[PDB]
Design an enzyme around this catalytic site. Structure first.
Site, mmCIF file in Angstrom:
data_model
loop_
_atom_site.group_PDB
_atom_site.id
_atom_site.type_symbol
_atom_site.label_atom_id
_atom_site.label_comp_id
_atom_site.label_asym_id
_atom_site.label_seq_id
_atom_site.Cartn_x
_atom_site.Cartn_y
_atom_site.Cartn_z
ATOM 1 N N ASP A 35 0.823 -1.202 0.000
ATOM 2 C CA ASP A 35 0.000 0.000 0.000
ATOM 3 C C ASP A 35 0.865 1.264 0.000
ATOM 4 O O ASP A 35 1.365 1.669 1.049
ATOM 5 C CB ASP A 35 -0.913 -0.025 1.231
ATOM 6 C CG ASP A 35 -1.825 1.190 1.326
ATOM 7 O OD1 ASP A 35 -1.924 1.927 0.330
ATOM 8 O OD2 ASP A 35 -2.471 1.368 2.393
ATOM 9 N N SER A 199 -0.669 15.529 -12.105
ATOM 10 C CA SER A 199 -0.948 15.162 -13.481
ATOM 11 C C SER A 199 -1.178 16.414 -14.308
ATOM 12 O O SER A 199 -1.710 17.401 -13.820
ATOM 13 C CB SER A 199 -2.163 14.225 -13.546
ATOM 14 O OG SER A 199 -2.558 13.982 -14.878
#
Length: 330
Positions: A35, A199
């Site tokens: 994770d 992004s």
């Protein structure tokens, strides 16, 4: 040193991935959920409340000659999906895919929430975010990666998750045969303890690319792709009959639909998520309403590039002094 381990979807939907981890002496092998959005290595154990264990493999520290109680240390964590767990702490030898850390904090669960009990396939979590998020008190502990770092050939690990198939976590090297083209690296902020990046935009299907900054985290421990409501609306508007359902808890779509791809930007590069990756199947057995793999992050408080996005790429988690993230197509 290096390590390399195969990671395997827990079910036919890729709801999560499990990777075998050796703990203790002799080795006890547990299947953990790697994770990159948390920083605790915790396991089902011989100390876990008996009514809360249902088919998981447990760590028994009393059977390990290298286990040592970390005296006074406790831990307690809550995850974004509302699940939680807590307990005490041992140090022991932990190995992943041939890579060995001695003195690793292994957090033994005394309590786990229903979600964990009900998932027989996950024996615990291995956190790979920054150690600043580790919940051990009063002495915060380091992640497996942090402990391994100085020994690694290169201070990196990579995630190569499969679509409906196994994949690979590598530590200490970049497998140049595992991706196509070049890796595009992008800046990381560690200020919240995550692999947080920006992004450069998105496209829906064959649509034009929208240049826009989307701050989010690269999180192998989250199933879906969670993005701003504007972006998510723009995606699902291209699917006939798709709608946001408050009763179901997100966007659903007719199972008869063909889903468009979704592209996200990494610097000037582009990662394409095929439409099939965005199908998470009937909301309930036999339903013709299907659950979408792109969902709104509104009310999460952060955008999350979960497995839906990450499995479309070869991803480098670069833990150099100034960390960065790399993405390549594959």
């Amino acid at each position: 040193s290096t390590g390399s381990a195969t990671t395997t979807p827990i079910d036919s939907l890729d709801d999560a991935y499990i990777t075998p981890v050796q703990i203790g002496t002799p080795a006890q092998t547990l299947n953990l959920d790697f994770d990159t959005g948390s920083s605790d290595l915790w396991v089902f154990s011989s100390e876990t409340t008996a009514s809360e264990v249902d088919g998981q493999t447990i760590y028994t520290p009393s059977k390990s000659t290298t286990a040592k109680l970390l005296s006074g240390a406790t831990w307690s964590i809550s995850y974004g999906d509302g699940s939680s767990s807590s307990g005490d702490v041992y140090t022991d030898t932990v190995s992943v895919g041939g890579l060995t850390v001695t003195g690793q904090a292994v957090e033994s669960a005394k309590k786990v929430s229903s979600s964990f009990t009900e998932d027989s396939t996950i024996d615990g979590l291995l956190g790979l975010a920054f150690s600043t998020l580790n919940t051990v008190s009063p002495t915060q502990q380091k992640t497996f990666f942090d402990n391994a770092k100085a020994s690694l050939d290169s201070p990196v690990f990579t995630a190569d998750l499969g679509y409906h198939a196994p994949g690979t976590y590598n530590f200490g090297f970049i497998d140049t045969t595992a991706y196509t083209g070049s890796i595009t690296y992008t800046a990381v902020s560690t200020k919240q303890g995550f692999w947080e990046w920006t992004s450069t935009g998105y496209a829906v299907g064959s649509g034009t690319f929208k240049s826009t900054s989307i701050d989010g985290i690269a999180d192998t421990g989250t199933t879906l792709l969670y993005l701003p409501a504007t972006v998510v609306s723009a995606y699902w508007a291209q699917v006939s009959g798709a709608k946001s359902s408050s009763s179901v808890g997100g966007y659903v779509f007719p199972c008869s639909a063909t889903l468009p791809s979704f592209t996200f930007g990494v610097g000037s590069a582009r990662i394409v998520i095929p439409g099939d990756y965005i199908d998470f199947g009937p909301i309930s057995t036999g339903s013709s309403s299907c659950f979408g793999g792109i969902q709104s992050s509104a009310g999460i408080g952060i955008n999350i590039f979960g497995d839906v996005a990450l499995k479309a790429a070869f991803v480098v988690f670069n833990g150099a002094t100034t960390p960065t993230l790399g993405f390549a197509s594959k």
